[model samples]
Target: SNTNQSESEKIIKEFYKTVYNYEKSQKEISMTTVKELATDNVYQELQNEINVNNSYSPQQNTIQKSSVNENEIKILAYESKDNSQQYLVTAPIHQVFNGTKNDFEINQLIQIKNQKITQRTTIQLGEE
Candidate 1:
C-alpha cells in the first residue's frame, strides 16, 4: 500500500535542501542538485504568478518539523486524493515533545497548540 517511498525520498531531499540550502553553497560542485530537487522556489514562484489570477489557495502541504516554530507539521501534497484535499499541518504536540517521531498526517484528528495556530484539528489522510 505504501507506494510513496520514492516520492517521500524526493520530498525529504527537497526539504533538507530547501531548509539548509546545501547545494547553494559554493563548496558544492554544482547547484543543479538543489535546483533540480528543490521545488519550493518554483512552486512559490508559480504560486505568485497564479495567485492574482486565482482566488483559491494553492494545493500544497507544508509540514513544519520544529517544536519552537508554528510550522511544525508533516506536510504532503496530496493532489490525487480528493478526500484529503490541499492543506498544511503541524506535528502533534506529544510526538514533537514526548520523544515520538511520528509526523502529522492527513485525516489525523488531534489538538494543536502553537503561537500561530492553536487548538486545531488535524486530518489524517490515507487511512484507507
Candidate 2:
C-alpha cells in the first residue's frame, strides 16, 4: 500500500538496465516492460537509438555498440527532488557514446507519471 516510492525507483533502475539490453530484444519481455514503462517521448528516443545502432553496425552483436552501457554504470545515489513526478538518479555512468571517462557524476532525470517514465533526460557533471 505504501510502496509507490519503491515501485518508482525500481522502475527507474529497470528502465536503464533494459535500455542496454535493447539490441537483442527480439520479442523480449524486458523490452516489453520498457515499452510499457516508457512514454511517447521516451519510446521515440529509444527507437531512434535502435535505428541508429542498426544502421551503424551490420556485423554482429559482439560488443556494447549501444548508447548506455549497463555494466559501466552504477547508481551511487538518488534524490526525491521534491515532487511526485520529478526524481533524480545519480550514477557513475560511462556510456558507449560521446563519453567522457572523467565525468563521474551523471544526473539521470526521471519523470514518473502514474509510475511510468514519461520524460527522461540526462545531465553530465564534469566538474571535479
Give the runs in model 1 whose Cα sits over 4 Å from its true position.
1-6, 21-30, 39-73, 76-79, 82-128
Instruction: Report the lDDT tens digits of candidate 1 across residue range 33-65.
Output: 433433445434433433332323466423322
Give the runs in model 2 whose Cα sits over 4 Å from its true position. 1-3, 22-30, 57-62, 65-84, 92-106
Enumerate residue pairs that collide in model 2: none
TM-scores of the candidates are 0.24, 0.60
lDDT of each model, Cα atoms only?
0.32, 0.58
Q: What is the alpha-carbon RMSD of candidate 1 to the true structure? A: 14.5
Instruction: Give the CA lDDT, 0 to 100, for residue 10 in model 1.
Output: 40
lDDT by residue (tens digit), candidate 2, 73-115: 4443345544556666655433443332322446766777766
Candidate 1: residue 79 Cα off by (Å):
6.3
TM-score quality measure for candidate 1: 0.24
